[model samples]
Target: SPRRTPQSIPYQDLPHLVNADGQYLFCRYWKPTGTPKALIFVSHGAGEHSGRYEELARMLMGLDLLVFAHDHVGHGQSEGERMVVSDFHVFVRDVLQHVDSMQKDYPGLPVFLLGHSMGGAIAILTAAERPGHFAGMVLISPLVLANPESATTFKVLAAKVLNLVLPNLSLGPIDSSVLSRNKTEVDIYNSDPLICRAGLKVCFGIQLLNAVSRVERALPKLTVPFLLLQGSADRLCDSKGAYLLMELAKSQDKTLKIYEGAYHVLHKELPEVTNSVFHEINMWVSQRTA
Candidate 1:
């Protein structure tokens, strides 16, 4: 279900950009008060919009970095069917377009791509597609592989068949409790109006499963520096995928941090742990930029 009235933020006005498919995507920018040392373009996860990352953007702005993010097609303020996509590659293309726009707007600044969950998958795939385009990448609990329980052989086979006929069929709502150990964060996510509450579409599921395979096959092509963060207790996305990515990426400057008791959303986890993750990310970016 889409929200009739989107949530208002305190930032400046938002801008809309038309993608290759002619869909007007909603984009937002957070600029530091001083000159920006770097630019971070974010891709949000499935069923979530870019607005959810405002806190992260504000934190990065404090470090003198500009942050840009957009709601992918069929998500958030973007115009498309709710939570449905014909192909996952469209996600990668959209991100690349956004990246190109950012690079043009702020020439000579190092550009970094940061993604969460499904967005992480898009980041990896996009980086593989265009080597040396970005200075670095930060992936947080990326959905490299779906949970084994949900990705059973029978379901996958069925999705392949249903994708042709019932591509928009609702698969059901995701369990929000597994997103974080903090109940307050879970509550906010559950109650968020912009968050899609509908089930995954049959076509979208198929695309996701296929994207995972594609990214795995192309892992060796990634040459840019990347930082991967995963929660060991993440029930939604398997942390084993993170280990696999770290083992396969060709980048010599790759790093992976596994949090023992944390849940899926490290940025929204308990305050102390989340702050530490933020500090680590800032330090990593600073070193790379230096």
Candidate 2:
């Protein structure tokens, strides 16, 4: 007897209009074979593209869901310098435009969002700005706060001055140690061709800090159904900050799950855990949409 294999599904490349900068965004929309039960708009983290979620996308597609993922303005296959940005608002605008475009294609279906890392920061801000745009949001290791000392008043001031004087200057080598507990994780991370291993540009660092600030400020306004997953050993974001965000969100339909032994890349590195997590998410979404 021959082993069975899942048939490959074709992904349609869709173009979205970005009103904030008058640019068109390139996105890949993978529609499942049967009628889609819902639409999931995904926003990826910095230094990585939407393609990094190939496995996750396949999983969701198998669940009879339509998945839409796009690279940010400066990451992956998208057009822009790697990890460089003058302002933070452009990121939020890009995500909002993409979500709107997804809604146009899947009208009358429940629309949800899944944002990871820096993209989670973008998602939180976008959701706060436009309540009811999404039925719910699932955040993975959200960048609600940078390392404790990175955003101090004086440090932020210095960063602003440096950005003004040397916008393109490399801050220093990226501290991938902040992303994972194990040092070997850095090697695996750098090995990815799509992952940019260069130092953060001054402007990019400034914009990232600003985005984190916005997410913190808007926490109280995030009233939509929200689920936040944080790694207990996460090296990227401040785990305590995620707790603070959940407390401040004031959402009646919000829950935060902390993976005790997991790192920042829990969703990708831990398959069994990821499956269970997604199953719970699907249940939450289905209950509302069904």
Candidate 3:
């Protein structure tokens, strides 16, 4: 299902792996010039591909870290219906599977999990299932709870019925403006070829709701140290969810940083804060891995 030739773009040689479910998953990696001190496995947000994180990956590589990321089954050049999954747990499973493969490849190196938005949910769920698997986890504006006003009982019922009858129905377009304050970043997101512009499928939306509920229940079981980054002004995911996670998670070394007046995508925010964010992440990772 890869439409474009992998070799066509010299720098974007995405490798393929057959997942446990027999899906051909596409993955890419950024390696440090010398031996890496740690490995950062990235799980990108909804409607976005792993390629969008190249700049962040390069930054990590500069810190003598290796970064690997993969497109979800239905996303980017991966094999599946565009932006749809039967169950959200499949995403979590895919991440753990990828991490297992990486652990085998780099046997003794410390590995960290980095996830943004929906990917953050997957990362959290995966970490919960596999305690002590990763050295640390970084969650960026995770989709733990939907904007409260939009998730009323009536809408939930409607979505359930729609999912049963018409799983692939489009929900509507996502507001690209909420992604970043940077005009250029917003434009890039709006025009990105791999970005999912269509509305959410009914089944996928239902699965997201289920996934959030499951994550909330599993919070007390999360023993892995984590860094949760959130924006106070994020329009898509509520900051309250991050606070709730901080309250419920039992990890002794967990950290939560709420960026005032920032949007959902903190890494793509204005240079001043974005630089500070990456610095905080690197500092935390270095301390933990050391």
Candidate 4:
């Protein structure tokens, strides 16, 4: 059962909305009672779905703000082979289409965006393409440029070259070093049966590299008011990456907050502390719409 709150509302599911790749995208919306002050559209990370954000959605609904999110074409309940994509730009196209759909649904209401990790990269790129489309944005542990060691040009070049010859090659075992460092999260992640067991394909590495390139090229044009949050201990997407992003964004209203001792999934890992993160997000949405 959905939790009870002052303005808590039931979730509305939208299935098979056509996005890019000519594939269907699935989404859910939580609209609060009374006139909405702002509408927040969320995008998930790689290998994850919109359903995982139920907790965060409920929290935002309690604040009387509408929250909407969609499962990318290859993720969640959307139709497609999991993590299979020939062009990383398709992800950018998918986000753009979703935002267009949201505008059509709530013509006059203010719109904001929240994207985590890979979704952050996609959102940043989308914002660059159409800066004035959204009023504000909140990026949680955004995957901008990788860590210095992870950003080797030769490594990216080698992956792209290898992908042409061996597109289906599996990158070694899942590196859960970040998760394993946190005993509680490691247990939960490993115990979760619904999590897919597919290994990362070589092409995915190429796609990721391409996505990072897009992020770099588009960052200078992101002028929308945005809030960025990074976990100091987040090893999956390092803190340095977030800093690199902030340096590129020219938005005078941009803010970056770092949470010490927190990991990549700070929303789930440190819910109590991250409440301020969401609250700050709600505040921004409210301010923009007002």
Candidate 5:
């Protein structure tokens, strides 16, 4: 059977994997110049594809880490409905599937997980499923808890009711201006054709609401080392979640870095912040990998 990605590229011509649900997932891999010291799986956020993490992936590559990722099912070039998934667990399942498949090619290599926004929920859930599986994890503005105003009790109740009748109701697209303080990064996001500009469907919000609750349950049991990067002024995801995770997770080697006045995507924030973010990751990961 021939299946094409959202971009109209045939799966046959690209490095792809069939998810458990039988949909094709687009994959990207950044191999090191020589032997790799560790394997890093980068999970992109909602409404965006995996390619956006290339710069961070490239930086990790400089350290001889084999960085790999996949455009999650229903997002980017992957197969399925746009921004719609049957269950939040589906994202975690696909991450596990892709990571497992990659692990086969480089057995015994230390594997790390890096994810942002909704992808962090997936990472948290995935790591919980298989304890001690990941050597470390990195989270950037993870969606542990929904924004206060966005998911107020009244609004959440309203969304639930509407989801039953009109699950496809538009929830409005995110304002790119809040993604980062750097105008250039916001411009990139606004112009990226792969990044879905459409409003999120009610059905997807339902999934995320449940995912927020689910990741909370998983957080307490997480013992793997992790570094959380949160922006104080982020409107997309709450910075409180970072503090909560730091409190709940049992990892002795956990760290939380908060960038004041920064926006959602710390990796693509202002130049100084971005440099520090990359440097911090390099230091945190390399020490453990070394």
Candidate 6:
């Protein structure tokens, strides 16, 4: 039997891994020219895919870091309903699975985690579960605390009530305008064929609520060194989440960099912000990986 990805690519010809659910999750890797100093696993934001991480991965490779990522289940080139996750834990499980497999080949190498938006939640939980496995983590505009102004408690309550019976209700698509300050990047996101533009389902929102609760509980247990980046003007995720992570996480090497007037996607934000973000990540990881 032949299996094809959502992008119509054959699984046999592409790098992929089957999850516990037996779904084909597409993967990507950027190998440095010589020996790699460390390994970085990227967890992309919700509704986005691993392909969008190429720019970030390339920069890390320049530092002699072997970078890799995968389209999460139910996402780009992966098997499952588009942008729909049955449980948030599934994301964490798959991340560990992929990392473990990679670690086998590069045993004794320091490992790092990088995530954005909802993927930030996944990253925190993953390191929390593995405890001491990751050398450090990099979070860019993570969804640690769902922005109260953007996703109010009132709306979450309403969504929870509706989930009791109308779990399939449509909750409108994300406003791409708030994602970045660069129109060019915004347009690229809008035009990306793999990006699912359909309205988010109420059930998915419920899952995110579960994830938020879990992230809150996991915060006290986290001790991994991390670098958290947040944009002051980010409309999608709350800036306070970064502040809370700074206070709550027990890691002694934690650092939070706040960028004023930037948007949610700092990696893809304006040229100035994006460069600083990359510089921070590369410098931080380079020092830690050594």
Stretches of candidate 6 off by over 4 Å are none
Q: What TM-score does each of the candidates earn?
A: 0.93, 0.86, 0.94, 0.87, 0.98, 0.97
Cα displacement (Å) at residue 27, model 6: 0.6
Clashes of 4: 0
For model 6, what is the error of residue 150's alpha carbon versus the real structure, in angstroms, after optimal superposition?
4.9
lDDT of 2 by residue, 1-290 (tens): 32111111122233434446544344777789988988888888888878777776777777777988777876765556678765888888777777776678778888778888898888888889887667888888888986666676888888899988998888666576656555555567778776777878888888888888888889888888988888887766878878988788967899888878777875664665566667766666666654
Rank candidates by lDDT, best first: 5, 6, 1, 3, 2, 4
Candidate 5 residue pairs that clash: none
Instruction: List all candidate RMSDs to the true structure.
Output: 3.1, 6.7, 2.4, 5.9, 1.0, 1.1
Clashing pairs in 1: 172-199
lDDT of 6 at 135: 95
Candidate 1: clashing residue pairs, number = 1
lDDT of 4: 0.75
| Candidate of highest lDDT | 5
Candidate 6 local Cα displacement, residue 266, angstroms: 0.2
- Model 2 steric clash pairs: 178-235
The candidate scoring highest on TM-score is: 5
* Overall local distance difference test of candidate 5: 0.91
lDDT of 6 by residue, 164-256 (tens): 989988878978899999999999999999888887888888888888889999999899999999999988888988899899999989998
Worst lDDT run of 10 residues, candidate 3, spans 2-11
Off by over 4 Å in 2: 1-24, 175-188, 270-276
RMSD of 4: 5.9
